[PDB]
Design a protein around this nucleic acid. Structure first.
Ligand SMILES: [Mg+2]
Ligand SMILES: [Mg+2]
Ligand SMILES: [Mg+2]
Ligand SMILES: [Mg+2]
Ligand SMILES: [Mg+2]
Ligand SMILES: [Mg+2]
Ligand SMILES: [Mg+2]
Ligand SMILES: [Mg+2]
Ligand SMILES: [Mg+2]
Ligand SMILES: [Mg+2]
Ligand SMILES: [Mg+2]
Ligand SMILES: [Mg+2]
Ligand SMILES: [Mg+2]
Ligand SMILES: [Mg+2]
Ligand SMILES: [Mg+2]
Ligand SMILES: [Mg+2]
Ligand SMILES: [Mg+2]
Length: 63
RNA sequence: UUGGAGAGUUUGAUCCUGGCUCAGGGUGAACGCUGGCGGCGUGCCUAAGACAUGCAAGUCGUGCGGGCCGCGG
């Protein structure tokens, strides 16, 4: 239910009463998009850098 | 004087500080896998929520008057 109320002349009011329909239909019609997710790139270098130094100095003791 | 053990864990390494973690005993327990026997214990820590049926409190004729029936005539 749409009401186009502001012009003196009706056929302008219809021009606007209509397009409030059509452009409203488009908004509720087209919805977001593809795609997700991205996956991690440098976990090969980065985290096996941290498993490098971790294993080495781990052969120590104590605390 | 019948009683007192610690380890792992920050650093390239070190010493200190300091948290985290584990091995110990315990239980009215539960859960998983398994399950032969006996004894002594022990078993609603939740909803002091709600409950079917039976049973948990009576007895005395040597306190008193009755009624129902068994017997003596
Ligand atoms: Mg996305
Ligand atoms: Mg280290
Ligand atoms: Mg310590
Ligand atoms: Mg430090
Ligand atoms: Mg001890
Ligand atoms: Mg224990
Ligand atoms: Mg069995
Ligand atoms: Mg079984
Ligand atoms: Mg028993
Ligand atoms: Mg109960
Ligand atoms: Mg109780
Ligand atoms: Mg209590
Ligand atoms: Mg109830
Ligand atoms: Mg309740
Ligand atoms: Mg009884
Ligand atoms: Mg009397
Ligand atoms: Mg009598």
């Amino acid at each position: 239910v749409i009401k186009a109320q502001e012009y003196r002349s009706q056929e302008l009011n219809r021009e606007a009463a209509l397009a409030r329909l059509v452009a409203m239909i488009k908004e509720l019609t087209t919805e977001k998009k593809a795609r997700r997710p991205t996956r991690p790139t440098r976990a090969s270098k980065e985290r096996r850098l941290a498993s490098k130094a971790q294993k080495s100095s781990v052969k120590a003791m104590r605390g």
